């Protein structure tokens, strides 16, 4: 079975994300490489995790620096267990973390991107936008929008992300609730991504980004570009994880479903972000011969036994995971008297 890792977004964050999964050894020592990249602009990803509270959920500087670094680390996990992918996706902001997963981007050069990505952004200044998760096909919204008010997260087959005028989808909604259709808002702490909004931002970000990014590593065909048609995965933008690339990322439309295409049929899909929110798009647009594993759920009482459960789940998926790679090693040989084995193996007789 083809290993996929899918890398979800923003909406994602939530009050407490991996203070549980803080204990882990790999993780808080991932987290705080973070810390280090991040020291130079006074700022300290630990305490932002530490400091939640509703300000920093919708801060999207904050929200962008904890959720590439929580996926990060939960990477690093995954390898610890000893299992790279086969397949990799990104959905918005979620290839940041990709093209480290894809080797193509330093840890540093990760997290520090997400930081000005983020902070640009906000200076910018951007007008009140607004985004929402809303079951219609692509091709429905296309028809049945309001001006300016963009299809921007292209999701399953008949699940499309508008994004657009904060003002204008409030009134849209309570148009659209009304008919019985899906309406699940996301937190953007007020920017419309993906849309027109973001060519005000593309000039100064990306000039900035250049300092950061340079330079520019290959990244591999394990990973399918969401940003970039799949007509030009040859060409010379999408060659490499560079500065352009990223702005790139937060300019276009999300060709998720697109890249779903590509995804095998006996396939097991990790959703590495804090939260499980492509639960519902990935088991729909996907094979039901796919099993699809989350990895934190949010508002859980500790999410070290939910992200074991689940790695638990990728067992019993068929995967090759080992989950002594989490924990520091034990002193062999084991003490005497510690219990047989034999004798509890049994078989189909």
């Known amino acids: 079975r083809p290993v996929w890792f899918i890398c979800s977004g923003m909406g994602a964050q939530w009050q407490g994300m991996g203070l549980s999964l803080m204990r882990l050894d790999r993780f808080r020592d991932s987290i705080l490489r973070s810390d280090q990249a991040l020291k130079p602009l006074g700022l300290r990803v630990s305490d932002l995790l530490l400091s939640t509270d509703e300000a920093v959920l919708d801060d999207i500087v904050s929200s962008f620096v904890s959720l590439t670094s929580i996926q990060i680390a939960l990477i690093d996990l995954l390898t610890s267990l000893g299992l790279q992918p086969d397949g990799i996706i990104g959905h918005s902001l979620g290839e940041v973390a990709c093209g480290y997963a894809d080797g193509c981007l330093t840890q540093e050069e990760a997290v520090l991107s997400s930081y000005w990505r983020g902070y640009c952004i906000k200076e910018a200044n951007v007008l009140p936008g607004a985004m929402a998760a809303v079951g219609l096909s692509w091709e429905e919204c296309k028809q049945r929008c309001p001006p300016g008010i963009v299809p921007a997260c292209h999701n399953s087959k008949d699940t499309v992300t508008i994004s657009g005028p904060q003002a204008a989808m409030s009134e849209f909604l309570q148009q659209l609730k009304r008919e019985d259709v899906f309406v699940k808002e996301v937190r953007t702490g007020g920017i419309a991504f993906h849309s027109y909004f973001m060519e005000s931002i593309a000039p100064t970000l990306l000039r900035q980004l250049r300092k950061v990014i340079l330079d520019p590593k290959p990244r591999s065909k394990r990973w ?106 034990v002193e062999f040989p084991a003490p005497r008297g510690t219990p047989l084995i034999s004798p509890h193996i049994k078989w189909d007789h």
Not at 266 to 277: F, R, S
Not at 286 to 312: A, Q, W, Y
């Open 224 to 329: 399918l570009s969401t940003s970039i048609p799949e007509a030009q995965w040859q060409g010379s933008l999408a060659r490499t994880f560079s500065a352009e690339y990223s702005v790139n990322n937060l300019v276009s439309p999300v060709l998720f479903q697109e890249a779903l295409q590509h995804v095998p049929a006996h396939a097991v899909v990790v959703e590495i972000a804090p939260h499980a929110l492509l639960q519902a798009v990935l088991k729909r647009s996907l094979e039901s011969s796919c099993t699809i594993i989350p990895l934190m759920k949010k508002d859980h009482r500790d999410n070290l036994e939910f992200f074991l459960s689940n790695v638990g789940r990728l067992h019993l998926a068929g995967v090759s995971v080992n989950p002594n790679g989490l924990f520091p090693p």
